[PDB]
Design an enzyme around this catalytic site. Structure first.
Site, PDB file in Angstrom:
ATOM      1  N   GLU A  57       0.715  -1.099  -0.220  1.00 31.59           N
ATOM      2  CA  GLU A  57      -0.136   0.004  -0.001  1.00 31.59           C
ATOM      3  C   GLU A  57       0.743   1.389  -0.032  1.00 31.59           C
ATOM      4  O   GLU A  57       1.835   1.250   0.571  1.00 31.59           O
ATOM      5  CB  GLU A  57      -0.680   0.120   1.192  1.00 31.59           C
ATOM      6  N   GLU A  72      -2.608  10.842   2.949  1.00 33.68           N
ATOM      7  CA  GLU A  72      -3.414  10.877   4.029  1.00 33.68           C
ATOM      8  C   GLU A  72      -3.637  12.561   4.646  1.00 33.68           C
ATOM      9  O   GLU A  72      -2.544  12.796   5.382  1.00 33.68           O
ATOM     10  CB  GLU A  72      -3.591  10.000   5.030  1.00 33.68           C
TER      11      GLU A  72
END
Ligand SMILES: [Ca+2]
Ligand SMILES: [Ca+2]
Ligand SMILES: [Ca+2]
Ligand SMILES: [Ca+2]
Ligand SMILES: [Ca+2]
Ligand SMILES: [Ca+2]
Length: 241
Positions: free
Chosen positions: A53, A57
Site C-alpha cells: 500500500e 492521507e
C-alpha cells in the site's frame, strides 16, 4: 453497525506500476482521514501474504499538510514510513493535484507537480504485484494520530474534480519518457465500469464506508462523512478556478 458513515471510491482494476493524479479539495476536522492511496486488495488478511500500500492521507487535525506512507510487511506486522508534507493553501481550502508515481525503482509523491517525497529502493522493492487507486474519507479511533474526533464539524466533504491514470511504459512514453496516459475521468458522471463504491469497515475506523455517501454533482465526485442516518449532500460544489 457503526454510528458514522464515510465513503470510498476505488478502481475496479489493479495495476502494476503507473502514475496516478487526482485534482482534489480534501476534507478535514479533528479526528478525520481524507485520502488518495494505492492498495493491493486483500493486504489486510492475516494469512501470511504481503501488505502492499502507498498512501496520501490528510489527518484532520492538520489540514495544512498530508501524511505520506508506504506499508509493507504483513497484516499484524506492518512496516511503515510516515512522513509529513506541507500543502498551501490548506488541503481543505483549495484544490491541489496530488500525484503518485510508482515504478520498480521508486515511489514519488507530488503536489501540483512538485516532489514532496521520493523513496528509492527499500520498501519500494517490496511493493510487488498490483494495486488499485482509491480515495476514502473516514475517522480514526487513534486520537494521537488524527486528533480527538469533533462530531460537531460533520458533515464533511472531499471533492474530486478529475483523475488521470498513466501506464508504466519505460522508455516508450511520449518523447522517450516512462509513462503513457491510459485513461482520464472528469467525473461528469459516476462510471460504474471503472469505479466501485466501498461498503465495509475495519478495526480502528469509527465509520462504515458506505455507497450512500458517494455523490456525483456538477462535474465532481463527492465523498461524504456524516453521522449515520444523516447521509446527504445538498449544498454547492466548490469552484476550481
Ligand atoms: Ca450502531
Ligand atoms: Ca523483498
Ligand atoms: Ca468526539
Ligand atoms: Ca487506455
Ligand atoms: Ca459497493
Ligand atoms: Ca470535473
Amino acid at each position: 453497525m457503526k454510528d458514522f458513515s464515510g465513503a470510498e471510491l476505488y478502481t475496479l482494476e489493479e495495476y502494476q506500476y503507473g502514475k496516478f493524479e487526482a485534482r482534489m479539495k480534501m476534507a478535514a476536522a479533528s479526528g478525520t482521514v481524507s485520502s488518495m492511496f494505492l492498495y493491493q486488495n486483500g493486504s489486510e488478511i492475516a494469512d501470511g501474504r504481503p501488505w502492499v500500500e502507498v498512501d496520501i492521507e490528510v489527518l484532520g487535525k492538520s489540514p495544512g499538510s498530508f501524511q505520506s506512507n508506504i506499508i509493507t510487511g504483513k497484516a499484524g506486522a506492518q512496516k511503515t514510513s510516515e512522513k509529513h508534507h506541507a500543502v498551501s493553501p490548506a488541503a481543505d481550502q483549495a484544490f491541489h493535484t496530488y500525484g503518485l508515481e510508482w515504478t520498480p525503482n521508486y515511489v514519488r509523491w507530488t503536489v501540483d507537480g512538485q516532489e514532496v517525497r521520493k523513496t528509492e529502493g527499500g520498501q519500494v522493492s517490496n511493493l510487488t504485484g498490483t494495486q488499485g487507486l482509491r480515495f476514502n474519507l473516514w475517522s480514526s479511533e487513534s486520537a494521537a494520530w488524527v486528533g480527538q474526533f469533533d462530531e460537531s464539524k460533520l458533515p464533511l466533504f472531499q471533492f474530486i474534480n478529475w483523475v488521470k491514470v498513466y501506464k508504466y511504459t519505460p522508455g516508450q512514453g511520449e518523447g522517450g519518457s516512462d509513462f503513457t496516459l491510459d485513461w482520464t475521468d472528469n467525473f461528469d458522471t459516476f462510471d460504474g465500469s471503472r469505479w466501485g463504491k466501498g461498503d465495509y469497515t475495519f478495526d480502528g475506523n469509527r465509520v462504515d464506508l458506505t455507497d450512500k455517501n458517494i455523490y456525483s454533482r456538477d462535474g465532481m465526485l463527492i465523498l461524504a462523512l456524516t453521522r449515520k442516518g444523516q447521509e446527504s449532500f445538498n449544498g454547492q460544489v466548490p469552484r476550481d478556478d
